[PDB]
Amino acid sequence: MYTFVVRDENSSVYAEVSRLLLATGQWKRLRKDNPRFNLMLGERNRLPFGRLGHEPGLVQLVNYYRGADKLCRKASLVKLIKTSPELSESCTWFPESYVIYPTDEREVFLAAYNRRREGREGNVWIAKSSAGAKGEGILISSEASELLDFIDEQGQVHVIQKYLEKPLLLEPGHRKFDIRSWVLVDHLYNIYLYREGVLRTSSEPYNSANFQDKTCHLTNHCIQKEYSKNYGRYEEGNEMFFEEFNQYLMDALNTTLENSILLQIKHIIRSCLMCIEPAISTKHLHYQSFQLFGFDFMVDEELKVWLIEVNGAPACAQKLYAELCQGIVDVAISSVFPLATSIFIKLHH
Template sequence: MADLSYLFVQRDAGSSVYTAVAKYLQTREDKSWKKVPRDSTRFNLMLGDRNKLPYSKLGQIRGLTQVVNYYRGSDVICRKASLVRTLKDYCEEKKLHMFEWMPTSFVIYPPCDQEVVVIGEEKFVRQRRSRSDERDQLKKCAEREPHVIWIAKSSNGAKGDGIQISSDVGSLVQMVDSQRKAYVIQRYIDSPLLLSGGRKFDIRCWVLIDATYTIYLYREGVLRTASEEYEPDRLDHLTAHLTNHALQQELSENFGKYEVGNEMFYDEFDSFLQDKYGVGLAAAILPQIRSIVKTCLGIVQSKLNTTGLDFWSFQLLGFDFMVDNDLKVWLLEVNGAPACAQKLLSSLVQSLVETAIDPLFVPYGQVQYGPNLFDQI
């Protein structure tokens, strides 16, 4: 009897989410999927690392439907510098003011080499940059508001690596010039909404784009919380300012003191908002998040469009937000390969497969699903 299974390859370990997707497909009771070696050319689904996917090899077998777990070109919003550039270019083209939910941001590039400039009989050596950056605009902005605090973040950094916070713009630019990668220097949100113990947090939301570019927001989210009380006058106290899990776990003795794994979930956050402000998450925060997500993904849709290609794409994104003490939501960054809180992983994976994969490859048998927690926005 012919094997009717759909075939998938797992080219790289990839994110924890897609590792869990691979396991889920192999253990689901309908037995519709079969894993084949990573170098196979005949497959329906490719799961891999977004930076190592062989897009040119997709869609080569006539009559074979293929889908891959990343949209090619998603770096236009998944790298910090590219996100800033993309939003600025759009606003400039449309003659709009910059979006109010994006902190004032400038892209700074380090020098890439040197050039000799001759003026009369004098020779000068100056640093030449890989492309024009925004250091002059940043310095002018800082001169107008000398007491503003700024945060410098590597364009492709992770786990809090290389982040510096300072009101001295000159020192931040000097730091960037000693690096080999682009940085975003951004106005620091110095009036954050604080949890019990006066602690900062950010919100990770999971967003799914399916093969038809329909956008879904996962119904649950997680607050990544700080271990220490927020101290605006101590900018070097990283565990009070940066909520990254890896950094908190490595540097703070208080990691896990307030929340298990420094993670708070929506139900508890909703109760906090109700008690403090008399308004809940659904009314105060989520409408802002949905609006920001739709705007960002609408702007880049033409850059990610797969129309005319011989394969399909879908992608899970991690949108990170901060909330200030006026309950205003700010976009921090977009992660192209987000991890998921362990508590939510199994339901997120099941919902992802049901939303993005099953419509393209209808299961052969009955599947006992749990609730699908992706809502279209």
């Protein structure tokens, strides 16, 4: 029967997958460095892609796409969008962004900053990085100078995306949020969108004049659970599902989640992944790859969807692990290693 190895012990998603695989009675686990495996649940950094697919008589699959980092790191994502003809500088769903080193865009960033300054247009900018966990290393200011010195205060790269000053605010609460979507790409490069997303919602009322607050503006589950007093009032753990957010949109705005938001979501997902398809595809390769991505979106008050970032090692909501993890095994693993409806929306292309 089939064999697999676990090399990322701190993975919530694949800890359930490996657990469900053993309960099948047709999968056997091995130590981290046993090379005679059918499936690798590999590490997150420096995964040895070069050692895969060289074992006679063993079809080898892995849960990561070599090169997918170019889409999952903020600095590289900006580069990909600005230099890829498929995406182009004239991209309508990605906020105006610039990569700033402490190749560089320090001066071109200020060129557009003053073109808005003179025109009285909103000049709120945000600085971000993929190296700061637990919401550390974020800044929202309206004066550009006072952020470049802070960027140089550290010795790594930061990006400067736009701050969406007019988000969609939920009522009751007058509060902010972002949307997390989970997308599975199998060995055939079929793009599967998990039907169940989640709203990661802020519990503090949005305040435009005061960006001093560390929590009025950042909605990630953690910064609201150990930095705010209102965690859990309107919904459990600042997490609202699609069925409710859909009902709210029908009642409050007379529209649906599918029409107003999800079509834009599906367009961005397939646009981003089809851009890098020829650089990471494992169709005619000696090993094959799949990977589950976590796309983070955000909706403005005109119901326009914006992409903020893509996470390549995402966690899932407590309330969908069982269903999602089962879907991975069904579509990503058993599809390659067969045994003795659907939760995914296939994004065709």
